[PDB]
């Protein structure tokens with residue numbers, strides 16, 4: 001297994017339509033729609049891309065996937081009932097900016113009743129409260145946790161964790177920015193480059209990303225300073241924008 | 254401006270206050286309460302958060318309370334026994350990161366040996382599950398990463414390479430942890446513990462040195478090291494019998 005290998009878009013689409021034929025052969029009238037998502041769905045796949053497809057099923061409670069390799073390429077096909085997919089499309093978790101670009105990258109190749117259009121409309125019409133709640137949760141569940149981890153590093157080590165943690169913090173900052181601006185990053189590789197181009201960044205986030213994007217992560221004192229500055233920028237930014245969590249109670253239940 | 258420095262004794266006070274609140278609020282529906290994580294192992298440092306698990310009798314109970322006081326952070330998970338036992342016996346790609354919870358339990362209340370039963374379940378998972386998880390990890394994560402850094406080599410962007418290299422090193426540490434059936438103690442010790450194990454795939458220790466030192470700016474050296482680690486994976490998995498099925502063009 002020396003793959004993945006170089007492939008053309010033409011070769012990838014040939015594979016997509018073979019999979020389409022197998023899906024229709026196997027599930028027949030239970031198939032509501034089939035779409036390609038990811039880079040191939042946007043027709044911006046590069047030489048080494050994977051193949052990602054989604055199938056809307058009529059079967060109640062259908063929720064399964066097939067993910068496999070031939071050693072030279074890899075495919076993931078998800079199968080969901082319409083109800084399960086629409087619910088997923090309207091839930092906003094802390095990694096919504098990483099997961100839900102699926103619904104903005106759909107290339108329908110089969111659709112028996114506007115089903116993929118419905119999916120897109122549901123994904124693009126999520127209410128503002130869900131993004132507000134997800135941002136407040138991200139601050140508590142991830143950012144506050146990371147601050148404790150790098151502050152522990154400052155006092156007791158290990159600095160060998162600091163480069164990885166710094167990457168994690170920059171990624172969480174990109175989720176914060178993506179939820180706030182309601183943007184779904186196009187690829188894994190474009191998360192940080194797209195995050196730092198957005199407007200109204202928390203102070204210190206740009207600088208933190210500069211270390212991560214340059215790969216210059218060996219100066220622990222500079223990183224800890226940049227992390228603290230970003231944590232300060234977070235505090236100012238969330239109160240400016242009203243992402244306020246009541247922290248007054250020792251036990252809030 | 255938190256989290257702040259706290260002592261182990263201050264954290265244990267908080268834990269017992271939460272225990273009292275849980276028993277007042279839920280009463281006889283509480284089967285057991287435990288602390289896990291660094292505090293459960295009694296190795297918490299100055300800034301650690303507090304993590305607790307409850308076993309509930311209510312069928313389908315599955316919720317959590319996670320909050321900060323501005324100064325410290327707590328997460329309390331509430332699960333039925335059946336939901337928790339099921340979770341404790343499922344082996345995903347990140348089992349070495351997640352299931353140390355079950356080897357870190359400090360019991361503080363237990364009406365019927367429930368925490369011990371959860372621990373026994375977690376420690377007795379079938380070997381085949383780890384095999385399946387490793388084969389899944391190779392396909393679903395490592396093969397994906399290889400395509401991503403090979404795309405970087407030919408079309409950029411190299412600004413993704415340090416973050417991607419960190420991801421690959423972490424995925425290699427999951428592979429090692431699944432193989433040796435070990436749950437890393439903390440986020441921070443994953444890579445130092447992974448590279449101390451025996452039977453490392455070739456190229457893995459070298460790759461991790463870039464990640465641990467933070468020397469992630471030489472893109473050609475990183476790409477060469479990823480390729481060597483990817484080669485090392487192929488020899489290693491074949492040697493240990495983690496054979497990925499590549500025979501089907503469409504496997505359904």
Ligand SMILES: NC[C@@H]1O[C@H](O[C@H]2[C@@H](O)[C@H](O[C@@H]3[C@@H](O)[C@H](N)C[C@H](N)[C@H]3O[C@H]3O[C@H](CN)[C@@H](O)[C@H](O)[C@H]3N)O[C@@H]2CO)[C@H](N)[C@@H](O)[C@@H]1O
Nearest residue numbers: 141142290304315316319328330331332336337340351354
């Ligand atoms: N509690 C047992 C089981 O937990 C599962 O969820 C697991 C996982 O998704 C979930 O992850 C939750 C998130 O969700 C939530 N949004 C933030 C929270 N900090 C995080 O917590 C988890 O991840 C952290 C690292 N990031 C760890 O530090 C932490 O100890 C761990 N409990 O925690 C669970 C593992 O502890 C299922 N809910 C269910 O099978 C069952 O209830």
Ligand SMILES: NC[C@@H]1O[C@H](O[C@H]2[C@@H](O)[C@H](O[C@@H]3[C@@H](O)[C@H](N)C[C@H](N)[C@H]3O[C@H]3O[C@H](CN)[C@@H](O)[C@H](O)[C@H]3N)O[C@@H]2CO)[C@H](N)[C@@H](O)[C@@H]1O
Nearest residue numbers: 038052063064067076078079080084085088099102393394
């Ligand atoms: N399909 C719609 C919904 O997806 C959910 O799960 C989501 C998520 O956990 C799941 O993640 C799956 C994993 O599990 C599986 N073990 C490896 C697989 N490559 C991964 O795939 C996901 O993460 C990858 C990045 N590493 C992305 O490249 C990929 O596009 C994305 N589908 O993909 C789903 C997003 O597509 C639920 N299954 C369900 O609510 C519903 O089916």
Ligand SMILES: [Ca+2]
Nearest residue numbers: 358368369372
């Ligand atoms: Ca025990």
Ligand SMILES: [Mg+2]
Nearest residue numbers: 141142145328
């Ligand atoms: Mg946590």
Ligand SMILES: [Mg+2]
Nearest residue numbers: 050076393397
């Ligand atoms: Mg994937």
